[PDB]
Design a binder for this molecule. Structure first.
Ligand SMILES: COc1cccc2cc(C(=O)N[C@H](C(=O)N[C@@H](Cc3ccccc3)[C@H](O)C(=O)N3CSC(C)(C)[C@H]3C(=O)NCc3c(C)cccc3C)[C@H]3CCOC3)oc12
Lengths: 99, 99
């Protein structure tokens, strides 16, 4: 698709068999989702954004669909205010900015 | 241009007579720049994201050049860690996300 920016670029994702709303965010290095259960071991990470930092749990090699496009990659879980799809997964789905 | 997302999508902007580097950020509603002077009236605003909120100054009707493309809109000024071009100005330069 071609997504314009007059409104927030929200899409549906699927993760853990569940549909969720998430923001396609070219300003985010990483993908971070609100609290949920994911399989496997996690590693610690801190991420730093407009307000300061939050602590999150890093899960690797997680199956995730973004607007119907399949990806498998790193998903961070923690107290983010919205679900954010960042560049690590935007690149998997072939997204570019164009003007 | 077509900008890939392998690295942060940073571009040169001209604002207030100054050259700055800034991030093309589809996750940002607003545009926020590190401390600088701008003309005209302003009012205070709080903006929030990862790590919470910061206080900024809101200037309206500010001319800007983003990667060679002119526009006008509201520009926020305050203690942002990164200069951010958000959707309010990305629309005006014709930027879309494509996949
Ligand atoms: C101290 O922090 C940083 C320092 C130096 C470099 C980086 C790079 C990043 C980064 O990529 N941070 C991401 C991030 O929060 N990026 C955000 C932008 C940003 C980048 C660098 C520094 C600071 C912010 C995001 O693109 C956005 O706009 N978000 C994510 S949360 C959001 C959807 C609410 C929105 C927001 O903050 N909006 C606030 C906002 C802005 C920025 C402008 C105008 C109005 C508002 C409301 C997190 C999220 C997952 O990956 C890591 O942080 C950095």
């Amino acid at each position: 698709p071609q997504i314009t920016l007059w409104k927030r670029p929200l899409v549906t994702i699927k993760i853990g068999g569940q549909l969720k709303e998430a923001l396609l965010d070219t300003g985010a290095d990483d993908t971070v989702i609100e609290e949920m259960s994911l399989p496997g071991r996690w590693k610690p990470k801190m991420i730093g954004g407009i307000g300061g930092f939050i602590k999150v749990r890093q899960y690797d090699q997680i199956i995730i669909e973004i607007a119907g496009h399949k990806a498998i990659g790193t998903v961070l879980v923690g107290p983010t205010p919205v679900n954010i799809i960042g560049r690590n997964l935007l690149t998997q789905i072939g997204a570019t900015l164009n003007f």
